[PDB]
């Protein structure tokens, strides 16, 4: 069986590598976000106590921060508005709903790794980005 958790030479796990391969085009974004889901969902079926997204490569970067440091807005949009409806893969959701009375519904977005966190905040990695770093502004 392959190792979901294994790393490459540069420390990038599979999910990091789904971020490196993204190129901000729709068909790639449609796909990578689909495939980002499935391994990320699969890693709750097998190895249910890991939290892949917390894994840091050689440069100390998570797949979320690496999507934000490298200009990957589609993957970033996916990871941040992520809502998974399956029961045993709900904890891997990130956009929740706390109530829905009629047309109104109150969503909750996690703020892990966005606010002034430990290693690399998504706001810092976006705000303090190098100038090339595509879609700094989006």
């Amino acid at each position: 069986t392959a190792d979901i958790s294994a790393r490459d030479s540069v420390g990038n796990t599979v999910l990091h590598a789904l971020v490196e391969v993204a190129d901000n085009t729709a068909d790639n974004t449609k796909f990578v976000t689909s495939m980002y889901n499935e391994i990320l969902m699969l890693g709750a079926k097998l190895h249910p106590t890991l939290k892949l997204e917390e894994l840091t490569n050689k440069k100390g970067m998570t797949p979320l921060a690496l999507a934000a440091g490298t200009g990957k807005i589609g993957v970033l949009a996916y990871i941040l508005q992520r809502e998974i409806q399956e029961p045993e893969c709900r904890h891997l959701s990130r956009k929740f709903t706390e109530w829905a009375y009629g047309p109104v519904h109150s969503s909750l977005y996690d703020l892990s790794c966005i606010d002034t966190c430990e290693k690399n905040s998504v706001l810092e990695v976006i705000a303090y980005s190098s100038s090339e770093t595509p879609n700094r502004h989006d």
Partner: protein
């Protein structure tokens, strides 16, 4: 509850700090549009005296003040439970006064007009509109 009274004892078994009798609790935690305790909890109340004080009951808190169980069935889009409750009383003029149910307030909430007929009109339930005006009883 047969062997004491069922009447005050249900009123003492209203969830404190909310006023939820067992009836309102049931439609909250539904499964595929039915709990299967809702028919039973009506059976406890029709045999043993004072059926009205279960259906006319509502939240006691100032924040859901007046939200009878009839309002619940209208939001959850259960045509049946609207039929079931109005048979057993369940006043169709119960004013959901609560702060959740008041004008915009700059806070979370849904204003529909405080009355169950206005809830159905503002919920896309036209069947429940025509029902509440010509049902058979009230």
């Amino acid at each position: 509850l047969q062997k004491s009274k069922k009447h005050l004892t249900d009123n003492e078994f209203k969830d404190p700090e909310t006023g939820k009798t067992c009836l309102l609790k049931a439609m909250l935690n539904l499964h595929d549009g039915q709990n299967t305790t809702i028919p039973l909890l009506l059976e406890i109340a029709r045999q043993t005296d004072s059926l009205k004080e279960l259906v006319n009951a509502s939240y006691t808190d100032s924040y859901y003040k007046g939200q009878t169980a009839l309002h619940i069935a209208i939001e959850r889009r259960n045509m049946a439970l609207v039929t079931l409750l109005v048979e057993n009383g369940a006043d169709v003029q119960a004013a959901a006064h609560g702060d959740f149910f008041k004008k915009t307030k700059g806070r979370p909430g849904f204003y529909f007009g405080e009355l169950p007929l206005s809830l159905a009109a503002c919920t896309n339930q036209l069947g429940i509109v025509k029902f509440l005006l010509q049902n058979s009883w009230q």
